Design a protein around this ligand. Sequence first.
Ligand SMILES: [Fe+3]
Ligand SMILES: [Fe+3]
Lengths: 828, 827
Amino acid sequence: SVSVKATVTVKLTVGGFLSSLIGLSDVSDWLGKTLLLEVVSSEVDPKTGLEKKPIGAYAHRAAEKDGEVTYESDFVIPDDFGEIGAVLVQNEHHKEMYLRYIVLDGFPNGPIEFNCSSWVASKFDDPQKRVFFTNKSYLPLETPSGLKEIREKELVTLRGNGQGERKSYDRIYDYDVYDDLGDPDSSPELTRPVLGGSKQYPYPRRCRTGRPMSKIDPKAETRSSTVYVPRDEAFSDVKELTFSTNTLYSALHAVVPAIESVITDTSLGFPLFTKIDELYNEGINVPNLKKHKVLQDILPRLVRAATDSLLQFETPQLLLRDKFSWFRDEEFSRQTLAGLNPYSIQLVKEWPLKSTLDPKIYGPPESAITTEIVEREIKGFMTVDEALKQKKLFIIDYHDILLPYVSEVRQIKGTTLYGSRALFFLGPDNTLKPLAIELVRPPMDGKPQWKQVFTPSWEATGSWLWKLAKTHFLAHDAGYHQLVSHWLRTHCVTEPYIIATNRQLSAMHPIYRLLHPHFRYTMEINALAREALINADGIIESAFTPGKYSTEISSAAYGLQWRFDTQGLPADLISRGIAVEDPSSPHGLKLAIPDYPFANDGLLLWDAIKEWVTDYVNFFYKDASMVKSDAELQAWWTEIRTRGHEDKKDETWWPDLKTPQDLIGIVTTMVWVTSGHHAAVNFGQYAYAGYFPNRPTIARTNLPSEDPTEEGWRRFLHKPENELLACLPTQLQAAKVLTVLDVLSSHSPDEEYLGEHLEPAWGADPLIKAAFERFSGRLKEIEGIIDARNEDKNLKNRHGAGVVPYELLKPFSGAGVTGKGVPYSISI
Amino acid sequence: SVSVKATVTVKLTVGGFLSSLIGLSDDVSDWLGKTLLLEVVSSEVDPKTGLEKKPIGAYAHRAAEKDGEVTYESDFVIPDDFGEIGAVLVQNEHHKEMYLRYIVLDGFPNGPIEFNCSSWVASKFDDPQKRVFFTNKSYLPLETPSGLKEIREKELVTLRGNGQGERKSYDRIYDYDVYDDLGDPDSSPELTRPVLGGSKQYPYPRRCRTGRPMSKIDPKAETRSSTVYVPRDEAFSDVKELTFSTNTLYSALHAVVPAIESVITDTSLGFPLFTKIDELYNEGINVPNLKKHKVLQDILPRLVRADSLLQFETPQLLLRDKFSWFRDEEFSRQTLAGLNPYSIQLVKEWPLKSTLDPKIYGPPESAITTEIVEREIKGFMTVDEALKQKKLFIIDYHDILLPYVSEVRQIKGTTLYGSRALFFLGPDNTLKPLAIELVRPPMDGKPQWKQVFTPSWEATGSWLWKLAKTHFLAHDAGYHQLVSHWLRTHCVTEPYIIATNRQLSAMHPIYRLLHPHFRYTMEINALAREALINADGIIESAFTPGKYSTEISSAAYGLQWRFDTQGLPADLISRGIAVEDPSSPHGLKLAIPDYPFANDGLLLWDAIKEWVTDYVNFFYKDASMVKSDAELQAWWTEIRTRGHEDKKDETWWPDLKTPQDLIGIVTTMVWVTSGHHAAVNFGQYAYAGYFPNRPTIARTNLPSEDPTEEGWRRFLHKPENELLACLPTQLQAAKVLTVLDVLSSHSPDEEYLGEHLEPAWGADPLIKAAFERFSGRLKEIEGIIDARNEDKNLKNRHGAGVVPYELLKPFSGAGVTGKGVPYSISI
Ligand SMILES: [Fe+3]
Ligand SMILES: [Fe+3]
């Protein structure tokens, strides 16, 4: 018999810490007397073939260091037991405890580490014993015989039965539709359509919460301020208060209601551009502030010291470099390639431009952007048909997706809408020139279709109409960026992958341990987004052009455009006509826009990631038969298509999962989206939209040339800047958006950067640890490649007088709003 | 024997009132005087002897006291055989001078006899010779009544003086003398300036002789003085209100400006933020040494408010559009409708080429190229089609500026280039800027530096374009202020005024036609040679050429100024903007059809010319009457040979032999004093009050001129700090903004072209009728212009955020209205 010492390290903390500290509803009641431990053998009883009996041991307290308590248990294990493959834990305390890790000592051949990083419920809440595996990873068919049944049982435990209201201690991962965003029990004006489950509103599923349905609106799930996620996905409880989720929680439920308390007039615009400059210079006095000093610690870039507090915004990086760049047309076009939404521009392949909408409903489909209008601005270089053949015309085209909403959005007080197109021309020095913006209003109110084209002009009136048309198009791009490029294609579509990973891949599965850092933090951020960002009267509705139709439009974009096989960066660039496969070219891709900072730097990250994923997959899957025979892997991919993205389960574009290369393609796509895609659309938000006239979230008024009256037109001619002010966000909308965007762009102190620190199971296997080291080195090299590109005067889309260097895909960064740094996961 | 009563009306006031009120240097009781000796002069000689009858006397005695108008009174008796009275002589017994408004003779049966005096009558102790005032009837010299021939010629002798002496206060002597009082070589060899006028290298219009002693350290320099002499009646400030243009400007240059120079002590302190520039208009500067005046808050309300607060009003350009000053289309629109519409000219020859000495100034070929231009315009037409169809236009300062670059570049706080700016007229008749070329001549051993800048699609070329615009705009500011404004109006006009008083009798009809167009100018120019264009004056302290600024105006004078291109039609033809075409409006086909200054100016030209035609034709029935007018002939000769002596030999001076010749000369003169001056003067604060739109100086070189790796990186990192470093200092900005707000303000007693007539004009029925037609034509033009500013097809005056072009509307109220055309150069 061998003597064994079990050391259990527990973190000192409590759930729901921040809510109290900032005032929205003892230390001795926290920790328990003892913990029951059971060591589990990796091998079944030889000869009998049944599972050996776990050997128990109760564990008691010992020391307290660095905010972490140790629990100790000295026991003895028979020698015919074999290696230990897992440990079972039961909490006898009446409250949950957070277990950091477990070390088994006294073994000759070495210490045995278990990575817990989990809350262990009070047995009185859930009597089921928790199992923790060693850092050794196994395909299902390689599971040690003594662990095969416990592996399957734990998966059964996390799947649950698809019923019941989820309790805070549950660990059950399952799907449901977005039926929780409206508030019909509060007003029928807060009623919202269910997103997911129909041909008309397709949508990714989210984590099932199972709260009771409303009696007023039986399709709506009742609202709660405590939105369930499985217990360990609520990372905010064991992170510092500067953690992303904690800072965003504080902004949405403390700072924003405080803003709404001092800026009560919801229709008060800025009367002067100087008043906009005050947001950054003098700020806003907010006398209302519960626990004001705590917020000064949590949000130092926002809440400043003094019984009352000052809300004051930092200068956005765009303005620190060039106070005037926001109205230069070349910076407008530069930002389609290097700004916060690099995902919309595509190649023009058909000419003239023509809508696909039913002309019997939406009016004449021919674009008002004419060949002669184009040649007026490019002919000193080339003709239109020349430009088409040489891939020099590019477009951002929101016409067909936005026009079906115009009539309805225009019924909302304080906003309007157009179908819009922005046309660009790639010059000889590889910089974009904006050629035209077209704005359409469909036939409605008995009037016919309204349609105009605006261009940079030689005279003041057309020049001002151009500026107002940019404001409208920019507001459409803000909505598309926030709802589609950002919310839909990262946050929203990823949550079903997370759910399926926990439902179908065992915690000891290698692909689970590969995906895990890329999936942390996201489910909890998304739950807060459903509670306060994309809900009825939430942040986006209150400040973006489409109002209450904002989230529906992301459903339409999902149904119309989203497919898994174009989410990887090469396939996205190819799909938009920006690249063609070319063995001669860097990365195998010939770019029709050669200086495209987002895409140039993204392909460096894509290759580095792919090579890491290749090394990892090849370590565990030596051939196609090992892929096809992995029942967990196959069940995982199947559930992603059939439940997570159920509304697209029948589409033909889903990749096969039959070879190791198939798996590499699938994983690289997922983890590129959660790291670099999200980073590129997320951490530049304050830099470019913090000074909101550069990127307004809403254009509140129609163009003066839309059915003008003599008196309105004369107002426009007299004081055109006042038309822009009346069109730009209100003071309340500006403060709310700036507050949220500053938080979203901020790297928390404990941000986990792509390829900086390895996972426990990765560092436990020498060949994986080595591959991670090569990955980390590749990323550090990429840092140096990007830094040189930002000093290259030939790359005018990232280097120039007053130009912001493109750093959003530099992997590593310090804390704060730095404009660089790529986390593993969607963390904010 | 007829009994007549004289009613002299004298205004209660004293000379130099402002200088006391502004605390820099006798009580209402002692102001006036005791008696006034009046002598009536008959217009007819003795029909027997043919000798002049003697004048009938009478002492006038202080009689009444009303309305700041004290009247003297004198009853006396005139013989039956005296004749119609043609003049009255006046003598002042008081030790102080006095200012008479008018003299009325009551009693004669044919009506009252009214004498317009409007003049200061000195003490007999300073000048004993008595003062003659004529009736409002006008006479050519040969038509002079017999009893007035000798008095007429001797008043002219009195006004001319003896070409020597030092001019005293009470003097009324008009005479010429060169520009040798701008330097101050007697307080630094640095504050020394050359003499303008006299040399084939420093030609210049003459100015009013002051007589003050020469320089103990420099033979060719006149002493400096706190009182600059103009003939006594030309010092109109003494009888105008404190709000009068000359009074407000005296306040600014001698009170406000020194107070600013007392706080803002760092002559190199730039603006650290653009937000600091905005505070000029929204918060002001605290200026302490201003409550020493507390009169400034009444005289300069737009400026001196409430340690006193100097705050500036928002210029009109920014009221319409905070952002128009960034826009390339507003830059180009202002060559046609801004404060300097006189520089743009048609490109006739391509390619551009310098006329300067290649072995001193480098290759003369321009870096503007056909392929460079076609890169922007081929969407509309080729270069050859553009020159053939008159679609390319230029403002070219290269050859005049390049010779000064090396010397100006030795001045700390400034630099210089030779510049060209090229434009293209598109199909809706709006201009687009194509390129600016900046040139530095070979100096310091380096070759010629020459770069062309254009509107760009990339941030670096666009910021270099912005910086090139700043330099070009500084050059246009200097050329506007020194040439378009100072030289071609104020400066070249003063000799006309001098010659008119020297050679045309006050009773001469052309004297009386010209008088309102010449009022106020001489006193303003004296204020200018004392505080505006002097060594270390306002211009030198804030304008790109610094100490070389006035010389450049002499250079443009010598190189370019000719009398026969100063009329508006001849100016337009000379610049290639217009060709003579009987079938176009005004007989002129305009290459730039929507050209607000030229369109509106030709309306005024035609209205003025028809008034002058009517007046001249009333008095000169044929060429013989023009040829035999010894006064008129001596007038034109003195203007050529003495007023503009350095050009007296040029072949372009018009002849003066026919009524039509006279109409052309006068119309040219009075267009310049009214519409020309108004168009370059009263939009100054509107366009240059927000000085980044029109900076008076560009203090730093382009970053692309022999760049260092480090400086180039500063430029890339924070390009708006390059622009701040180039833009005027906080001292320079506060000085120019002060001056321009004053120059752009119409005093309340501003006399607008064709509103009120002169006394002699209203006295003759056909002249009055002709004036009424003139006045109506002008009122009509107001409504023509008002409609033009509502025409959306006239994109150069109508559009979103665009300042209407109102600078040549004839009538206005007081203040900085941006409209209204005075008779004269009044500010
Ligand atoms: Fe995000
Ligand atoms: Fe003037």
